[PDB]
From Swiss-Prot, chains A, B:
It is found in: Nucleus. GO terms for cellular component: chromatin; intermediate filament cytoskeleton; nuclear body; nucleoplasm; nucleus; transcription regulator complex. The lineage of its organism: Eukaryota, Metazoa, Chordata, Craniata, Vertebrata. It comes from Homo sapiens (Human). Residues 5-269 form the NR LBD domain. The chain holds residues 142 to 434 of 434 of the full protein. GO terms for biological process: cell differentiation; cellular response to molecule of bacterial origin; intestinal epithelial structure maintenance; intracellular receptor signaling pathway; negative regulation of DNA-templated transcription; negative regulation of transcription by RNA polymerase II; positive regulation of DNA-templated transcription; positive regulation of gene expression. This is Nuclear receptor subfamily 1 group I member 2. One of its GO terms (molecular function) is sequence-specific double-stranded DNA binding. Nuclear receptor that binds and is activated by variety of endogenous and xenobiotic compounds. Transcription factor that activates the transcription of multiple genes involved in the metabolism and secretion of potentially harmful xenobiotics, drugs and endogenous compounds. Activated by the antibiotic rifampicin and various plant metabolites, such as hyperforin, guggulipid, colupulone, and isoflavones. Response to specific ligands is species-specific. Activated by naturally occurring steroids, such as pregnenolone and progesterone. Hyperforin binds at S89, Q127, L128, R129, F130, H243. Keywords: Activator, DNA-binding, Metal-binding, Nucleus, Receptor, Transcription, Transcription regulation, Zinc, Zinc-finger.
Length: 270, 270
C-alpha cells in the first residue's frame, strides 16, 4: 500500500495538474496562422520534414478550417507553420510553468534553481501533456478545437515513436503527472545548485510511482511497467536534447522563437 | 456570312473581354475571410441556405486552406461568408464596369445612361462571366486559386439551375460576350433616357449573335440555339430581380454591401 505521505504527494501533483492543464485548450487564442495564398539549410530542411502535420480548426458555430502544409520546394515555405507552433509551444510552456509553481516541493527550492529546472525540463513536461491528447489510431493531437494530424516510416522519427510507444502503456493520470514530476526534478540540468535536495526529491517521486504501480496494477501486462516508464523518461531526455539543437539551428536562419521561448532556451537578444 | 461591320462588332467585344476579364483572378487579393474559431429573419434565413458553398484557397507554395460553412443554428453564423462574397462581387463588378467602358457603343452613350445600364445589368454580366469558370461536373466555380464548391434538389434554386443549363449549351467565348452585350444594352432599365438608341444597339447585338450561330453552328444539336440563349437572358433578368430583393433584405438586418455595391444598388448611406 501507498504510505500516507505518498498519497498526499500524488494528491498535490494531481491538484496542480487539474489547476494548470486546460485539457480543452479553451484559452489558447489569438495565435498566428499560416498566411493565405548552405549546408545549414540542408539540415534545417531535414529537421522539419519529419515533423509535418496538417491543421484543423473547428469553430463554435460548426465551421471547419483545414490547412494542408506545402511540400518542400527549396524555399521559405517550410517555415509557414513556425509562428503558429511557437504560439502553441508558448501556451503549453506557460501551463507547465504554472504547474511547477503550485507544487510545494518546487516553491521551496531557491528561485534560481527553479529557473534551471524549468529551463531543462519544460519541453519534456510539454511532450508528456501532449501525449495525453494524442490519438494513436489517427496520429492526431486533439487539442480541443485544434487538431494536428500527421501527414510507418514516420516511427523512425524519435519524437513520433515516443508518443506511439508511451500511449500504448495506457497510463493513468496519476502516472503521467508523476512522470512530469520525475522529469521536472532532474538533478543534473545545467545550473542546478541544490543537486542533493533535487536528487532525493526525484527519488521520492520515483518511489511513489513504483509503489503506485505495484498497488494498482497486478496484471501480467504491467510487469516491469515502472522500468518501462523510467526508460521512456531517459528517451524523452534524449529527445529534448536533439530537439533543442533543431530549434537553435532553425532560429539561426529563420527567427521564430517567442520571448518566453528565448528565455527558456537562453537566448539573450543580443 | 457575317457582314464586315458585324465582324468588327464581335472583335471589339472580344477585345474588351480580353482586356478586362482576369480569368485567373490573379489580382483578386486582400479579401476578407470567415473568422477562425422576426419574420424578416425567417426569410433572410431561407435566402442564404440554398446558395451555400465551401471555400478552398490554394497557395503559391502548394498549401491548401479549406473552409466548410456552419449549419444554420438560429444565429449570425449564416453571415460568416458575406464579407468575402461582397469582396468577390465587388472585384467582379469592377471588371464588368471596365468591360463596358472599353466598348465604343457604350462610351458614346450619355454618362447618366451608362450608370443606369450598369446599375441594371452589372449582376447579370457578373453571372455570365462566372458561368465560364463553372464546373458543372463538380458544381464548383473555379476562380484561379479560389474554388467555391456547392455543398439535385439544389437545381430548384433558379441561380444554380441557370448555371447548369447555360453551361450545357457549350457556348463559345464569342457567344458569351454577345450575351453580355445584349444584357448590358437592355433599353428598359430604370432611368434610361436614350431608350431608342439603346434599343437598336441591343437589336444589332442580337442580330450579330443570330448570324454568328447560323454561320458557325450547323449541327442539329444547335437548332434553336439563338432562341435558347435569348430565353436564358430573360431568365437571368428574372434572377437579377429576385437576387436584388434578397440582397436588400439581408442588408436590412446585417449590413455587408461594399461602397461600390451600395452605389450599384442605390443605397445612399443616409
Ligand atoms: C517547437 C517545435 C517545432 C519544431 O517548431 C514544432 C514541433 C511540433 C509540436 C511538437 C509542437 C507543439 C505542438 C504539437 C501539436 C504537439 C506539435 C506536433 C508537431 C511538431 C513535432 O512539428
Ligand atoms: C452577392 C451575393 C451573395 C448572396 O452575397 C452571394 C452569392 C454567391 C455568389 C454568386 C457570389 C459571387 C461569387 C460566386 C462564387 C459566383 C458566388 C456563388 C455562391 C453564391 C450564390 O452564394
Amino acid at each position: 500500500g501507498l504510505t500516507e505521505e505518498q498519497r498526499m504527494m500524488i494528491r498535490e501533483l494531481m491538484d496542480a495538474q487539474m489547476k494548470t492543464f486546460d485539457t480543452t485548450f479553451s484559452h489558447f487564442k489569438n495565435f498566428r496562422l499560416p498566411g493565405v495564398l548552405a549546408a545549414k539549410w540542408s539540415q534545417v530542411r531535414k529537421d522539419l520534414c519529419s515533423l509535418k502535420v496538417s491543421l484543423q480548426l473547428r469553430g463554435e458555430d460548426g465551421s471547419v478550417w483545414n490547412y494542408k502544409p506545402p511540400a518542400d520546394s527549396g524555399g521559405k515555405e517550410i517555415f509557414s507553420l513556425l509562428p503558429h507552433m511557437a504560439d502553441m509551444s508558448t501556451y503549453m510552456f506557460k501551463g507547465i510553468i504554472s504547474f511547477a509553481k503550485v507544487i510545494s516541493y518546487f516553491r521551496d527550492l531557491p528561485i534560481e534553481d527553479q529557473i534551471s529546472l524549468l529551463k531543462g525540463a519544460a519541453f519534456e513536461l510539454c511532450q508528456l501533456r501532449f501525449n495525453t491528447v494524442f490519438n494513436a489510431e489517427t496520429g492526431t493531437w486533439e487539442c480541443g478545437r485544434l487538431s494536428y494530424c500527421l501527414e510507418q516510416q514516420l516511427l523512425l522519427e524519435p519524437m513520433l515513436k515516443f508518443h506511439y510507444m508511451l500511449k500504448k502503456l495506457q497510463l493513468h493520470e496519476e502516472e503521467y503527472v508523476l512522470m512530469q514530476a520525475i522529469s521536472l526534478f532532474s538533478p543534473d540540468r545545467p545550473g542546478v545548485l541544490q543537486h542533493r535536495v533535487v536528487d532525493q526529491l526525484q527519488e521520492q517521486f520515483a518511489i511513489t510511482l513504483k509503489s503506485y504501480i505495484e498497488c494498482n496494477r497486478p496484471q501480467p501486462a504491467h510487469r516491469f511497467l515502472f522500468l518501462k516508464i523510467m526508460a521512456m523518461l531517459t528517451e524523452l531526455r534524449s529527445i529534448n536534447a536533439q530537439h533543442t539543437q533543431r530549434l537553435l539551428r532553425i532560429q539561426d536562419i529563420h527567427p521564430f522563437a517567442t520571448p518566453l521561448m528565448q528565455e527558456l532556451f537562453g537566448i539573450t537578444g543580443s
